[PDB]
């Protein structure tokens, strides 16, 4: 288009022949607006507001002041195809994303913008509907090209379609509800140019769901629930001294990624394994990629100078996925965890589903023909700062039983942090199973490695502090280091008392965790 | 203690002197009024129960083929029978305990837990005549009484028993029941082979007035009023051919449960969520468990060889709440269930309900769509596309809507009234059976006579809503007309404005958003 300049590097977007925008902008949201139910009608974010906000919405520059003091030679960088996959995404969010990309990315480095309709059922995105999307696209450069799936395949399914259709040496995947900051793609391209084996991910800022205000705020690990988790304080303390507070312009390696939003050399991406194409809908596809990448000769970095705003959803869901899809994706990811899969399996509930075993083994066959390294290696070199680097760091996993009263601890059915622990009759169920992390002395319910027992008799969010460090003595006591008192089950009440090996009420029996050397997947 | 067949636990309830510790009452009076006696007894004739023996033999209701089975008692897991009760009469409560001990081998019965849910009767009291507490001393040690300081409800009372149970398996029973031979043996074997199975005995009946033993429908669905309903005729026909006439000895799956008489592995039960302990007093806890059980990796089966007789009898806010909480497990279908029970707006404890929404997602429980397509695919509404119309049936010519006239119960006539946009003027359509029904009662069906009647899945209730807007009845090929504020059938003709109706389309959201408080 024409009108090129700073702020609209691809020209004035969204103008018809007449010269007036082809987007009917909405008036200010109502005064009599109920916010808690609007975040459901909008599918996670306030849509009355997004519809009233302009598609060419300026956004503050969130990169560090030192990041702006850089220079990139556009003529010497490879072009890249940005891929935006979307399903039933509202018009305002989807176009504001495309606008933000086209407005803030030089055309010299943007080969194309591929939009992937993953079987949307909205009338504006359907080819048997009002045709608002397709019609409006003619008002965008040819770079922007829409492609569809006749049926919803999921993130993995839709993302491969975009990458497979991409034409550039590099692709950059983005969400359909995003806004970028200046020079967001330039750092990624330069980094992948010098080593095609690097998968680089931008730092993700936020667009508030309710207010749409721009909110600011690199190393990311994982939880044994098979969820991404940001490096905590005690984990950043285990870092090498010179990497504990890296500079704002440095590329920092990350054990894991936050799911989507990354750039990668297309050829390499297909040679390090693309995406397990049996992963369904939403799920843990971000870890299988993270684990697989590192073990098979790749690098995962984050560029603090490449920042992108993202609408994290709140009090609502944008789409509906089946209940089994999440467990399947986790089971398949456990293939890359080797012996540690035994623990991951118990945290997610020792589940047994149809994880498509036939195709999962062919990935194991692929894994061995590629010579990919082990997860123990991964844990010892890529994520050595984790609380569980070896399965010896989980010495006890099982019921915490007091023989005197003949009972064991019980989460009372809610393993989520915040509620109180009670004494009940032992039935050997997951509700009465507890594991121990010796690196931080955390006593946690098996089904949630974020909940930690405290002297108060209740669970709370696990922090690697003196407020959660427990000691399991040789006598069998649960001693709390800070106060140096031991936990007693006297009268079916949880109390702290002077430690004393003669008090049978404070002697506990905790099963030892001596799992196998190799995890054998379940049956179907 | 004198043990043998018929009294597998020995002679129960005898004092040291050698005389029963229960004074039987004489035959009920001849000048007895049944309606007044069935009131003092609380549902069942208590004058008779008091005169009936606690060691009352009962006919074996099991199929003759069920008796040709063999169980090795030494290889079966012990089970804790839990009987919860509130203000249950002595005779009925004890005849049950006697029947259990009399018809259950001691090797497989770890204990029998009696749960007093805050009874206020003098015989059940720590400050009363102490009839129950004393008489229990004359029963084996297996029998253990425990109480709740205040009436907590079924959910509250049953959990107290399950938590107090010490056996790998528990069996929940009513306080007014009598068992058949080998009632517990089939259940234990089934749960031993797969701890994920929740097995239910088939329920026979004890008449309330005469106390006759009555023979007893193993497949159970549900209504959009959130009530269990036994598979109707047209529903059993949608079953696969190999399950339309199941054998008397085969275990048959049931989408839902009809009251809380079931056995389950204790560990499994607590991992499948157990019972929403925010459910209050009596209510629909049987469906919330059923939906949750199936979606979270469990099975609900019925054992036709395990039979139990049950004496069927003859606050209000708790019930609406329990239904709201159950709708959490229905996903988008809650929109339909919500309008059928009257768009209620109450304090459903929206806080603790979210902990279930997280609990459900942390467990990876499947969707209600899955449930309806795999567990209850024989239902009349498998998808919300099976309910295409929901709204007033309006005739623009006379400017009126249909009206249930304030009753909605089957049997009453439909009249024509002026549209006010209320629930009494709302009607939904089930396309699998062509039922025109009032929204507040999916058991009432429009008929050509101009009246509602019990919905039966027959050609006698199948309506067709044409593209022109007519209500055509398939059997007679006649259309409904509102000529003269009267409902009558006329030869169909799209040019007649009196037989053209406007019915709102039902295109609900993709996810149900609960109301506020
Ligand atoms: O079956 C699906 C599910 C999601 N998405 C899209 O994938 C992108 C990433 O998912 P999402 O943003 O919902 O994940 P989040 O980052 O919010 O956790 C979004 O544009 C979704 O609309 C898709 O195309 N198909
Ligand atoms: O607040 C209550 C109400 C009832 N029950 C007992 O729970 C059992 C099942 O209740 P209900 O009488 O409704 O059984 P149904 O008659 O529906 O089979 C009976 O033994 C009741 O006495 C109880 O423990 N607490
Ligand atoms: C910190 C991070 O990267 N992701 C968090 C995750 O750890 C946490 O369990 C979840 C629930 O609050 O929210 C998200
Ligand atoms: Mn997103
Ligand atoms: Mn943390
Ligand atoms: Mn009953
Ligand atoms: Mn019926």
Numbering used by the authors:
A (entry chain B): 102 to 318, 322 to 628
B (entry chain A): 103 to 318, 321 to 418, 426 to 628
Sentences from the paper on this structure:
O-glycosylation of the protein CST1 by the mucin-type O-glycosyltransferase T. gondii (Txg) GalNAc-T3 influences cyst wall rigidity and stability. The structures reveal a unique GalNAc binding pocket that dictates the substrate preference of TxgGalNAc-T3, which is coupled to a 2nd metal binding site that is strictly conserved among apicomplexan homologs.
Overall, the lack of density for the peptide backbone or Thr-O-GalNAc at the C-terminal ends of the glycopeptides suggests a lack of strong interactions with the catalytic or lectin domain of TxgGalNAc-T3. Thr-O-GalNAc at the +1 position on the glycopeptides is bound to a pocket in TxgGalNAc-T3 consisting of His333 (catalytic domain) and Glu554 (lectin domain) that interact with GalNAc via sidechain H-bonds, and Ser334 (catalytic domain), which interacts with GalNAc through a mainchain H-bond. We observed density that appears to be a 2nd metal (Mn2+N) near the GalNAc binding pocket, a striking and unexpected feature not previously seen in metazoan GalNAc-Ts.
